[PDB]
């Protein structure tokens, strides 16, 4: 009813189709694609929130869903660096 | 070799004017003599840095390691003790003070006190179990009671691979 809560409902199957593309020998490619999926939905939700009239209460969930997936996107970025170093060392 | 360290330290003390600047290079001069096993020349160049940087915990720790490699127990301990005074984050060096005191005197209340300080920085440690065991075997019948409660209470943190179950 919020649009954001309706627009992110693919990611539960999109992350599964990305897991079923990779292996433990492509386990960083998996997390770089998880950042591209979350960053694509951050791009979509930003391109909805930037089009909401200020004070329209409904877009509260759209903004929380944007920030939640933006913090998720950078948490996949963090994982994709530090666990690569710790395995190379 | 010695002569390469001497040739480097001669040209690097040539490329130094004042005495305090020569002392400020003394830490690196001392490391190079230690890397030639010239332990007194290392001691002599670290002390001539310490008398110009009284507060460097690294220089006190390096002088302590040079006294450990001269078997001088309480001088290794004093330089390690002084390095813990100048940087208390060295839990490893609190343990190394207990390690060198229990290897010098088992009756020493400082050995038992520095083990107290090591245990309160590393609980559940078999190296600290054996540093207690080595005191408690020497505490006799009063030792045996403390040794039973120790063996029970630290097996309750790690079931041992062999020794503590036999003991």
């Amino acid at each position: 009813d919020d649009p954001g809560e309706a627009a992110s409902m693919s990611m539960f199957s999109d992350f599964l189709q990305s897991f079923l593309k990779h292996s433990s020998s492509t386990v960083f490619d998996l997390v770089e694609e998880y950042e591209n999926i979350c960053g694509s939905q951050v791009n979509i939700l930003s391109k909805i929130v930037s089009r909401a009239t200020p004070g329209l209460q409904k877009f509260s969930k759209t903004a929380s869903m944007l920030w939640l997936l933006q913090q998720e996107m950078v948490t996949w970025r963090l994982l994709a660096s530090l666990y690569r170093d710790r395995i190379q060392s | 070799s010695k002569a390469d360290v001497e040739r480097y330290i001669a040209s690097v003390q040539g490329s130094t004017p004042s005495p305090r600047q020569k002392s400020m290079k003394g830490f690196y001069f001392a490391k190079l003599y230690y890397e030639a096993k010239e332990y007194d020349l290392a001691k002599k160049y670290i002390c001539t840095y310490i008398n110009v940087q009284e507060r460097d915990p690294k220089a006190h720790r390096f002088l302590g390691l040079l006294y450990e490699l001269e078997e001088n127990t309480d001088k290794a301990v004093e330089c390690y003790r002084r390095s813990v005074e100048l940087n208390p984050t060295q839990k490893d060096l609190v343990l190394k003070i207990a390690e060198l005191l229990c290897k010098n005197d088992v009756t020493d209340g400082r050995a038992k006190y520095w083990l107290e300080r090591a245990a309160k920085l590393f609980p559940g440690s078999p190296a600290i179990y054996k540093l207690k065991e080595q005191l408690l075997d020497c505490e006799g019948e009063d030792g045996w009671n403390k040794l039973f409660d120790l063996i029970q209470s630290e097996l309750y943190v790690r079931p041992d691979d062999v020794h503590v179950n036999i003991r």
């Binding site: 939640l68 913090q71 998720e72 950078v74 948490t75 963090l78 994982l79 530090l82 | 690097v12 490329s15 130094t16 004017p17 600047q21 290079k25 690196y28 940087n87 984050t89």
Partner: protein
Amino acid sequence: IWKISCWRMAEDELFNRYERAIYAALSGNLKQLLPVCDTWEDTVWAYFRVMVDSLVEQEIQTSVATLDETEELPREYLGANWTLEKVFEELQATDKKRVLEENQEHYHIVQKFLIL
């Protein structure tokens, strides 16, 4: 000598908070950098940016035997003990109520533990 000069540009109240922070983020002055870091991410960044710069200065001043130099970089920064756990306690001792509320949300908690 340039870092000693940039630290001096960070500590006179007549410089702008942002210019003090610019020279601080390039000279290790966490104490003049935290006066501008106004998110959780900025506050974690201030500690980590100075932790690397301080550890780099400690390896350099152990390995590069300079000559004639008669001024010190400050002993609050040269004498700095660092650990990852410490930074994530200092991030809970801060007065910045925003950082204390962000340091309780789910992804900022995950970010602490993945860094540790």
